[PDB]
Design a protein around this ligand. Structure first.
Ligand code: NIY
Ligand code: NIY
Ligand code: NA
Ligand code: NA
Lengths: 308, 308
């Protein structure tokens, strides 16, 4: 398994694989990811931090951008309050075991040279393109603000300005990233992680939608959220419990079941779990019990560091 | 005639008259106008500079904003080239007899505090409103850029930032000004000048449309432009020659005519010229001859200073 294959594991796409391979040869290489600060850090965040850890293990210097100014532009509140949530997020990311440097967008995004660049990019970016790039990111607003279209060019210049080789984000960032690869002289390698389904199955997981498991949820809370989650027998597509099994659990996985329902089941890969679930050899209740118990153990060290 | 009435003369609107009156009482008061730098300075510019002179005579400190960064956002070229045209414009404005201070937008519009203000305003300004405010200003573009909607909030913050009591501009600026009066804590008094008709009568006069008389046009050039201008008998509405008579000429005005066509005509006011023209007592050819000759004399001192 290449460093390349370790990095590629469980990503949705890498733009491009050829470019990443060229990057991997260098002694010194950096990757960054930006997050609008979030009151709760959930499995979606953890999925991406896990990927940053993969990159770190492959010798990348990791930068976490606490995106206070973008969050401000996306109507998340006042900068001072946003920064405080950013600081909390840093502590959570540290509790996850990430070795990284942290920067606040506003530390450099209001510099004269940065701003001049933003305006230069604004001349090359159509309103239609800017709005399209924000469809999965923009806060819902019946009267869309000028701030909405400044946000994507702020993010485009961010990669350029700080000289990152690799930008990581969820699939929802991909249009902004495509714009960056088009507009900037140096092409940034983009690694996109899948977007987790919300627990009720009705859309994507999000801090604003209350459809997530937070990394510091209590065990009792995790069990309840999983008990109630969308998880139709035989259905893997859009099944958040199966997603958790794929992205977070380790294998071989032992699934405990009463003897009357077939007894304990040892599963050597997610792929084999998927076949058992599609073939209805594994019931949603037994899948859920195992996912809840293993996820609790996975998250325990993080919750404990945050509780201590 | 009040200072108020001197200021009001030949304006399209003042927002608001009550506010201007409060302003007039102060010992210290300033007014500014901004211009995207223009390769040619035309009668539209001169009309507004004349109004700045009125304000100066009423005891206002005048600031001319050479709007290099707005011009950049509105696709007028590179900043360095734009600034050079700005410097030329300053020399023309000085040749007009204006006593003012001149500043380049970019001297202060890229400051961290300015930019933070721009982003705060971007949160309060809808895209729909920003685009509407730019309809008569925005460079024609089949694929409108993000830069187009940054421009109006740049101009909104300009008035606020430099603490002007009064902003002057053409009617085309009125939506941006309305936005400023809505968004800022201090209401700026806005004085709007009429927009001159193009020489061919087919739209408004503009540097980009080649339908103007420039202040340094040669006498021969002025005569030719006027000879060819739209000027229907009896029609005052949208008649650029009648506009020049109203906004630039002094009265009493003597109109020279051959005896066979009624002989020389002395006109004591624009209002009386308008009645004679509507009643068809004054032929377009005779009106044009007088307007051309008087406009040449009006502009001679400006052209001469620029030629020297
Ligand atoms: N768009 C990201 C945040 C972000 C990512 C990368 C960035 O470079 C920046 N930025 O420049 O402020 C911001 C999000 O949805 O959470
Ligand atoms: N909109 C003006 C230029 C302008 C006027 C006033 C201003 O404050 C600024 N500005 O802030 O750059 C720019 C024009 O059409 O020529
Ligand atoms: Na080496
Ligand atoms: Na006094």
């Amino acid at each position: 398994m290449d460093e390349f294959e370790m990095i590629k594991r469980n990503t949705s796409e890498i733009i491009s694989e050829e470019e990443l391979r060229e990057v991997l040869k260098k002694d010194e290489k950096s990757a960054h990811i930006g997050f609008e600060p979030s009151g709760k850090i959930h499995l979606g965040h953890y999925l991406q931090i896990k990927k940053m850890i993969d990159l770190q293990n492959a010798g990348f210097d990791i930068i976490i951008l606490l995106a206070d100014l973008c969050a401000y532009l996306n109507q998340k509140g006042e900068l001072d309050e946003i920064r405080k949530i950013g600081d909390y997020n840093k502590k959570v990311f540290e509790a996850m075991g990430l070795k990284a440097k942290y920067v606040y967008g506003s530390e450099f995004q209001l510099d004269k040279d940065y701003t001049l660049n933003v305006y230069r990019l604004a001349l090359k970016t159509t309103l239609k393109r800017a709005r399209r790039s924000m469809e999965l990111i923009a806060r819902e607003d019946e009267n869309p603000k000028v701030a909405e279209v400044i946000y994507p060019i702020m993010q485009v210049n961010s990669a350029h300005y700080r000289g990152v080789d690799v930008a990581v984000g969820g699939m929802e960032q991909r249009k902004i990233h495509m714009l960056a690869r088009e507009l900037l002289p140096k092409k940034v390698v983009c690694i996109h992680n899948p977007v987790l389904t919300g627990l009720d199955g009705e859309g994507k997981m999000s801090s604003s939608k209350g459809n997530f498991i937070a990394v510091d949820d209590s065990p009792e809370e995790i069990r309840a959220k999983i008990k109630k989650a969308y998880c139709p027998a035989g259905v893997v597509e859009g099944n958040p419990i199966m997603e958790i099994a794929k992205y977070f659990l380790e294998y071989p996985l032992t699934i405990k079941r009463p003897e009357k329902f077939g007894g304990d089941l040892t599963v050597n890969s997610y792929e084999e779990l998927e076949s058992l679930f599609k073939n209805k050899e594994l019931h949603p209740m037994d899948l859920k019990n195992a996912v809840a118990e293993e996820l609790i153990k996975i998250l325990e060290p993080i919750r404990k560091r945050l509780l201590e």
